[PDB]
Amino acid sequence: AVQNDEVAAFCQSIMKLKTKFPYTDHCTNPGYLLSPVTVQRASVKVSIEIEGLQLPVTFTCDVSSTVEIIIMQALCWVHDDLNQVDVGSYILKVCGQEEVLQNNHCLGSHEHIQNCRKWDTEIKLQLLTLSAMCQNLARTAEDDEAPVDLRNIKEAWTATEQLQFTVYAAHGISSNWVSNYEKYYLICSLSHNGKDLFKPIQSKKVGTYKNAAYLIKWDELIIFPIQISQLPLESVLHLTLFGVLNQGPEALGKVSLTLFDFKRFLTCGTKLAYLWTERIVLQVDFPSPAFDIIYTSPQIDRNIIKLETLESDIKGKLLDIIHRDSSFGLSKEDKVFLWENRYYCLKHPNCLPKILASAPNWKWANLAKTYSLLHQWPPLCPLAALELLDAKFADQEVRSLAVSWMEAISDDELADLLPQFVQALKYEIYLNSSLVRFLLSRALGNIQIAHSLYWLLKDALHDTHFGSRYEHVLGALLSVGGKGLREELSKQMKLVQLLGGVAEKVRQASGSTRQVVLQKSMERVQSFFLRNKCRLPLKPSLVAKELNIKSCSFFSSNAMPLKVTMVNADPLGEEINVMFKVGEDLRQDMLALQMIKIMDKIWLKEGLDLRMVIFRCLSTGRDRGMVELVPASDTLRKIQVEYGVTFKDKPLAEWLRKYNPSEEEYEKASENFIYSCAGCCVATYVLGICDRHNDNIMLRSTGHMFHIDFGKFLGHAQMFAPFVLTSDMAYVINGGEKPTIRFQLFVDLCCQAYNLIRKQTNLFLNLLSLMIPSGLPELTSIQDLKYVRDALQPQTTDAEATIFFTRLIESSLGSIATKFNF
Ligand SMILES: O=C(CSc1nc2nccnc2c(=O)n1CCc1ccccc1)Nc1nccs1
């Protein structure tokens, strides 16, 4: 009745969000993906295909120069005078990939240019006009006009009535339940900011009702020692059903009711909540007076607190905690102090999460002072504001304000943070929030964000508690996306469903059968591509028209992953090679890759390029997805065995020399290793990945090292080498059997990198904190964050930290560590 109304009110606000995004505005409705940029605080050759010319013009561009001027550098090559050529209309796209470079960004900024530079591959672009550019994903006029398909009052603070409700009954219990369990009981808890207000109240233990084995009837009144006036707005009642077995009691399912609804009215009368195991209806009867109780916020306190009495004596302790890594591990006496001297910290905005976490309580009286500070507070950094969207800050005024600061973030930065933002929706108790409107707004204005949100929300649906919420959010995204986007995403969904069929069919056969099974199973995929051309879900810029069945294969390892080879719909493009894996939960692989990618962004933003391999991985359902295949790369295992057949101190060295024969070619390959290895060693330690052996590490022919398996992750239960540097690796780093200055470089890079991540301890702890609700196996507790914080040693300075990591490296070498110098 009220939840149907909430859904109605949601849709109408989404209908008026759509108004800000007309189909005519190309800015927000391009119809194509924008090639991503990562601002990085140098010459390259680019090869541009131009309409009319038989050969593409190849010239050297300044990496620093903007795409706009490179477009008319290319126009200067064809036209002696570019005054009648309508320079504005022309754009630059990557050859093969239906992604357009951003005109007002440096060429060096673009991820594609960065990648090409790393691999030393050719930058192939195409100069064209947006007329010729494919805009099939663009929204239409139809899409714009289309609708979205997914009495007397007492104010709360006066209400002295006690929070009580009678748990009445659960309906529709299963046959295997009445079999197993003898009696059932509910545990009722009341929380705000994700923390209990009072200890949970347990119900009486009751069997199924007489002459009705589908029903459990308690009909018991539960009374909490709290008045209605003491309840914060975002108060939530949790009910967990337990069942004591016949002949510890087991948690059958959870339910959460918000005590205040979306129009600030206290829940009255009978409320039905549905817990999933199978749909069980649980009835809770709240009191039902002749009057509606509404929540009203505290009266606005208007103050501008300016110059104040200052002391030196305590200012030092103040700036000590201001410049603390995070609000994690902050003791009681530290909080009371900061809270007292909060108005002095007005010149350091990024420490507001530290201040709000130091608040004595969120009592109605103490809110006017909190809101007074908040609405005179300077803007936070988007990445800092993330903390305010976590569980421990449920207040709407905090969250709404966190999202307003968040609006300052770029699409390109947001795109890689979306998993955390999707999880953050679980801490929004109301469907229609500032956060969901923010996400939907960005999705409308950027097709990469919309595309990413789709897959993330579709994975989130599998949450038994929050699956209902995400259903409405994804319905809003798909509706608002338009027919163009929808029809394309449908094709992508069908492709993965087909690739999924063959994947499990392949694994379910014998050795002989496997190769024939694949060739036969792929016929149904061949059929798909004859009636449609599909964009690759992993990288939707690539459009596959046909499958190269003769090139398709399986990787002979334990899940028997597929090697799907599709031919590009663009002849200027290159063949599409992706792996489709089934069985393994690729979400923790996704997180590891994300964390490593963010480490890379941090490093690059401080001018440290460790030449990291950053490959994609997408979960396209439960325990299945596709992984980007890095070309001309093998595992250290295969390298070690193939060149142990032919010495046994230099198998990697002689592998790199095979593909890099000249002195300068081997030099650049050895150098690539040094940098990439340093980055891997740092990442291995900080994220705690102790399953790093010859199979789990991979090496590109260009010299770049990278991890592939992330089964062990946040496993900081290690006995006192985190990472391993074998004699093979050391030989490549040194360029010899005796230590050189190249090892000093490796050690310098490691420590320098380590420290740049230590500087962003807060970000990493926030990013890992927000992924705890995901259900990833290692990430289950805040304690699991402490392990990462301990690895980052925020207490120590860069001097001591360098000494620590340098001792990690000396330990890493192990037996052969004797040869090097302390
Ligand atoms: O050349 C390769 C590299 S093999 C690989 N690359 C990866 N790249 C990124 C992430 N994960 C992996 C990965 O798991 N493997 C397979 C690991 C393996 C190795 C030997 C036996 C069983 C399993 N791919 C191709 N590009 C074009 C054609 S083929």
Return the residue matching tokens 């923010």: 438
Output the residue whose Cα is nearest ligand 1's atom 16. Answer: 555
Q: Rounded to 5, what percent of the chain is helix, strand, coil?
A: 40, 20, 40
Return the residue matching tokens 């968040």: 406
**Cα 628 to ligand 1 centre (Å):** 9
For residue 557, give the ligand 1 atom closest to its CA.
Answer: 22
**Cα 634 to ligand 1 centre (Å):** 7
Is the separation of the CB atoms in 597 and 589 below 8 Å?
no
Question: CA-CA distance, 578 to 617, in Å (whole number)?
Answer: 10
- Torsional class of 539: left (φ above 0), alpha (ψ -120 to 50), beta (otherwise): beta
Helix (H) or strand (E) holding 511: helix 511-521
CATH architecture classification, 26-141: Roll (3.10)
Is the separation of the CB atoms in 559 and 603 below 8 Å?
no
Question: CA-CA distance, 786 to 768, in Å (whole number)?
Answer: 11
For residue 617, give the ligand 1 atom closest to its CA.
Answer: 10
DSSP line for 167-224:
EEEEE---HHHHHHEEEEEEEEEEEETTEEEEEEEEPPPB-SPTT-TTEEEEEEEEEE
Q: Which of 332, 321, 237, 336 is nearest to 285 (CA)?
A: 237
Q: What is the resolution of this structure in A?
A: 2.9
Chain Cα centroid distance, residue 277: 27
What six digits make up the tokens of 730?
A: 């050391």
**Cα 412 to ligand 1 centre (Å):** 28
Q: Which of 78, 84, 65 is nearest to 127 (CA)?
A: 78
**Length of the chain measured in residues:** 822
Output the residue whose Cα is nearest ligand 1's atom 25. Answer: 631
Helix (H) or strand (E) holding 279: strand 279-286
**Cα 344 to ligand 1 centre (Å):** 55
Is the separation of the CB atoms in 792 and 761 below 8 Å?
yes
Other Cβ atoms less than 10 A from the Cβ of 216: the count is: 27
DSSP line for 628-694:
E--SSEEEHHHHHHHTT----S-HHHHHHHHH--SHHHHHHHHHHHHHHHHHHHHHHHHTT-----T
DSSP letter at 712? Answer: S
Spell 239-267 as b/e; 16+ CB within 10 A means b.
bbbbbeeeeeeeebbebbbebbbbeeebb
Question: CA-CA distance, 290 to 154, in Å (whole number)?
Answer: 10
Output the residue whose Cα is nearest ligand 1's atom 4. Answer: 634
How do beta strands 250-258 and 236-245 pair?
A: antiparallel
Question: CA-CA distance, 447 to 463, in Å (whole number)?
Answer: 26
Output the residue whose Cα is nearest ligand 1's atom 15. Answer: 629
Angle (CA) 413 414 415, round 5°: 95
Angle (CA) 410 413 416, round 5°: 140
Instruction: Dump strand ranges (E) for 108-177.
Output: 123-129, 152-155, 162-171
**Cα 597 to ligand 1 centre (Å):** 19
**Cα 175 to ligand 1 centre (Å):** 47
Return the residue matching tokens 């109240």: 201
- CA distance to 62, 106, 695, per residue, from 372 (Å): 50, 42, 57
Q: How was this structure determined?
A: X-ray
Residue of 589, 630, 637, 680 to test ligand 1 pocket, by largest number of atoms within 8 Å of CB: 630
Residue of 538, 633, 659, 676 to test ligand 1 pocket, by largest number of atoms within 8 Å of CB: 633
**Cα 544 to ligand 1 centre (Å):** 20
**Cα 598 to ligand 1 centre (Å):** 23
Superfamily of structural domain 1-1+300-485: Phosphatidylinositol 3-kinase, accessory domain (PIK) (1.25.40.70)
For residue 555, give the ligand 1 atom closest to its CA.
Answer: 22
Q: Is 255 helix (H, G, I), strand (E, B) or coil?
A: strand
Show the ligand 1 pocket: residues with CB < 6 angstroms: 555, 557, 577, 615, 627, 629-631, 633, 635, 698, 708
**Cα 589 to ligand 1 centre (Å):** 15
- Torsional class of 96: left (φ above 0), alpha (ψ -120 to 50), beta (otherwise): left
Is the separation of the CB atoms in 705 and 723 below 8 Å?
no
Residue of 577, 579, 640 to test ligand 1 pocket, by largest number of atoms within 8 Å of CB: 579
CATH architecture classification, 152-294: Sandwich (2.60)
DSSP letter at 311? Answer: -
Q: Is 602 helix (H, G, I), strand (E, B) or coil?
A: helix
Return the residue matching tokens 């070309």: 631
Output the residue whose Cα is nearest ligand 1's atom 7. Answer: 629
Question: CA-CA distance, 458 to 471, in Å (whole number)?
Answer: 8
Question: CA-CA distance, 249 to 797, in Å (whole number)?
Answer: 49
Chain gaps in the chain, named by the residue before each (C–N > 2.5 Å): 41, 150, 247, 277, 305, 646, 720
- CA distance to 146, 331, 415, 444, per residue, from 449 (Å): 22, 39, 6, 8
Output the residue whose Cα is nearest ligand 1's atom 1. Answer: 631
Residues 6 or more apart whose CB falls under 8 angstroms from that of 472 comprise 7, 10, 150, 431
**Cα 590 to ligand 1 centre (Å):** 16
**Cα 632 to ligand 1 centre (Å):** 9
Residue of 589, 614, 629 to test ligand 1 pocket, by largest number of atoms within 8 Å of CB: 629
Chain Cα centroid distance, residue 267: 35
DSSP line for 295-309:
--PPPPP--------
- Torsional class of 139: left (φ above 0), alpha (ψ -120 to 50), beta (otherwise): beta
Output the residue whose Cα is nearest ligand 1's atom 2. Answer: 631
